Design a protein around this ligand. Structure first.
Ligand SMILES: O=C(NCc1ccc(S(=O)(=O)c2cc(F)cc(F)c2)cc1)c1ccn2cccc2c1
Ligand SMILES: O=C(NCc1ccc(S(=O)(=O)c2cc(F)cc(F)c2)cc1)c1ccn2cccc2c1
Lengths: 471, 469
């Protein structure tokens, strides 16, 4: 069973002995620190952490003893704050005396703003605020996935609008292929759920259960897929029987969309000769609701996409849409699911536009690029103490390292406000209390072991919409 | 609760309908495909087998749940209820799969078979690749362990050159990555992988994972010591940095203690606070209880060199038997900002050029150690190489025309010693010709049971550096 006493960085076990004596409050905050592009971030994923790990009776006698035993060996010394943890157990029935205030999930906030704050509600538990830094800072991951996914959605939207005149299909243009390429089952669920804030297509099934349990949607599920081959279901037929494999598969899935990986031996042959001639009769008969989606999976992503489109355009009846861009017939589409990240996605869509191909023709699958190739440094997600009370006096505190001003942290009690122009500003030093800037946008989401405000996944999606979608 | 029927890539739900009719066997393998990182540490499969694959993993409830979810997720009825019911009825929900693998901790060159998977019941031909997704996640502990080991090689080389021995090597790269990974589960897995090579960790999650799934003779596999963070310094107020330092080293007077010293001005903290105001509290400390000064900002190499230069003018430096400068034994440095395999190399090489022993320093690495890694680094990949259809075995593979690096292996595979004592993977069942001795893979899973396993102590032995051996 999960034990919050064992869910911190080891050195934090020793910090209760290091704060100034007579300290009754430690108040800390999280931001995606600004850095001398990712100018705005989607706040998402705290609700998961609150419910799974922080709420309810999280301290028991057994958990305290277990931690005491582990730490004695891990430190070769007795340093664990058993008294501090016993107090929470006895006084609060093992509920954490902590209050967390946060911006609403799905909100899109510029870098360098407070996104949530944490403080102790009982003077005895001044040490608890930063005990839970480690677990709360892991919110960096769903924030960063959702943010990076949304930035890709902006690129797709821009190019789809330019080449087609509308945004139809946008929310199916970046499909999550990341389940095998992440570091754990738990990460799979969290990361897939964050991508679903922006899109509806996922093969990372773990995301669906997470959303159902911690967030909820009006619709039965938040994300969808359709049938598709993998190399094994093609290559199993034997090298001389690729056409047989293709025929069997598209016939099995004749009335729903089906994607078919086509590069097992020679992607160009497969497009021009197998699909474009031998099996063309099985493609041009398909419904607009049930296209074949051809999947190249190797070679330079841009060069291969363009060559695949050029081959298909010569074997199938292409039209020119009202923006002047080429469009495959509706029963035929392409998906690029190799080597896709935000940089190569941009390269591909720009290359397509230069060669007069509509973005209507393509979708993208992204695995490691979408869910794994991200770190806490991308958005500088960071948790710092800004305010303490010692001997009954509040003190505004911060770091400001001489050799790196980008690591300077905020001072005092913080609040998040709308500016007169409708942007965001974080007020420091308790200045929010002057009430010159309207209401604080941070809301209490956790207090004394209880989750006090929750958001549905539908609300989060609404909050995270693109301006272009709003327009 | 975990449900293996919901733990695959969606499209795999549809594959049972796509294989050739009358296919009775699908056999697949995992490798770190060949294209730096020439050899990989195989680690982490035992965790997956035990937590997710063994025992009764199918129930009526789990089948119904998957049926209900897939109906909505595909907007259609495509789920193989019958196949999963067959496993439930015939095998009490135990997977009819056999997995063979190289021993955990083994260090194997790229492009070799590391494990194989096949169905043991012809009805379950579709199950081999259903579990690709979950098994391929082994890429992560393999990659963390391998990259951690590659850093240990760098540290060993430079420590040996500058000190003449490897004393303290296994405490020179400390895991700081708990907050910088993507989940609690990943923290445990990744921290465990780093501990194949080192003994220092702050990622406590790794200890319980090792104890549960692998085991050590010692009570714990990894260790830490007290240290400050910026909050326990800055809480004292900007004009009281010295007071915080004094309090902290006094509370931890007889054990090692690390104190982050760059909250306001690292150079001032080193030269004036530690080097003058509090010098008497440092020079009095035991060799078993040094102060470990931690810079945490600025260019890592330049800052480390400047911190050493400052300390070397305030404290009594010696010259070791190799001619390198050594701080007194009560004083050390740890650099735990911006450390990855590349910057680690730059720092130890720069220290060497300035005649500073690597005895002086340790490194903490967070994101660089546990998060900034992907499946592409070692090209960890799972592919079908053999099928039986209509009673006939066929050697199968992919070979994409534009990328020969993605060519996969053909037929039944086995791993062998060469006459020179190296590894080779034989394809096409050639292992059966018995020209290369016994297959070095062992059966580790069969029909719901884990059939071979390794302690964490043996894994560490297998993963040792040549220089250590
Ligand atoms: O093919 C895969 N999944 C099915 C799939 C089919 C079609 C689209 S699509 O984006 O064209 C699409 C979406 C959708 F929800 C409605 C559609 F009509 C069209 C996406 C996924 C696939 C391939 C390689 N992988 C490697 C790791 C994981 C995977 C997943
Ligand atoms: O200071 C930290 N942990 C304690 C710590 C002290 C000393 C060494 S050491 O390698 O110098 C050392 C190891 C050890 F096991 C025996 C020693 F005597 C010496 C390592 C860790 C720390 C700092 C920043 N963080 C940011 C994220 C996580 C952390 C952890």
């Amino acid at each position: 069973e999960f034990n919050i006493l064992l869910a911190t960085d080891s050195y934090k076990v020793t910090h209760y002995k290091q704060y100034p004596p007579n300290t009754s409050k430690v108040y800390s905050y999280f931001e995606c620190r600004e850095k001398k592009k990712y100018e705005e971030t989607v706040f998402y994923g705290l609700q998961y952490i609150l419910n799974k790990y922080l709420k309810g009776k999280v301290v028991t006698k057994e958990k305290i003893q277990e931690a005491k035993d582990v730490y004695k060996e891990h430190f070769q010394d007795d340093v664990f704050n058993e008294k501090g943890w016993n107090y929470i157990l006895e006084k609060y029935d093992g509920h954490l005396p902590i209050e967390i205030k946060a911006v609403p999930e799905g909100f899109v906030i510029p870098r360098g703003n407070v996104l949530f704050t944490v403080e102790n509600t009982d003077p005895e538990c001044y040490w608890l605020t930063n005990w839970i830094e480690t677990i709360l800072v892991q919110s960096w991951y769903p924030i960063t996935v959702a943010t990076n996914s949304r930035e890709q959605k902006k690129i797709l939207a821009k190019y789809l609008l330019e080449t087609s005149g509308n945004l139809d299909g946008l929310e199916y243009k970046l499909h999550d292929f990341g389940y095998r390429g992440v570091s754990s089952q738990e990460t799979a669920g969290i990361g897939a759920s964050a991508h679903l804030v922006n899109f509806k297509g996922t093969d990372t099934v773990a995301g669906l259960a997470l959303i159902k349990k911690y967030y909820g949607t009006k619709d039965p599920v938040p994300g969808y897929s359709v049938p598709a081959a993998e190399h094994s279901t093609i290559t199993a037929w034997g090298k001389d029987h690729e056409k047989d494999a293709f025929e069997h598969i598209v016939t099995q899935f004749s009335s729903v969309p089906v994607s078919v990986v086509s590069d097992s031996y020679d992607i160009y042959n497969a497009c021009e000769k197998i699909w474009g001639e031998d099996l063309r009769h099985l493609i041009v008969s398909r419904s607009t609701q049930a296209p074949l989606i051809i999947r190249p999976d190797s070679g330079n992503p841009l060069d291969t996409v363009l060559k695949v489109l050029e081959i298909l355009g010569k074997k199938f009846p292409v039209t020119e849409n009202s923006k002047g861009y080429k469009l495959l017939p509706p029963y035929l589409r392409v998906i690029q699911g190799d080597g896709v990240d935000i940089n190569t996605l941009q390269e591909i869509v720009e290359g397509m536009k230069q060669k007069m191909w509509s973005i209507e023709n393509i979708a993208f699958g992204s695995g490691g690029g979408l869910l794994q190739k991200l770190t806490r440094d991308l958005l500088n997600c960071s948790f710092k103490c800004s305010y303490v009370v010692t001997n009954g006096l509040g003190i505004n505190v911060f770091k400001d390292p001489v050799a790196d001003p980008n690591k300077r942290s905020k001072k005092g009690r913080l609040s998040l406000h709308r500016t007169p122009a409708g942007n965001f500003v974080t007020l420091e030093e308790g200045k929010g209390d002057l009430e010159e800037y309207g209401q604080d946008l941070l809301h209490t989401v956790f207090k004394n072991g209880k989750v006090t405000k929750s958001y549905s996944f539908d609300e989060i999606r609404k909050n995270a919409q693109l301006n272009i979608e709003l327009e």
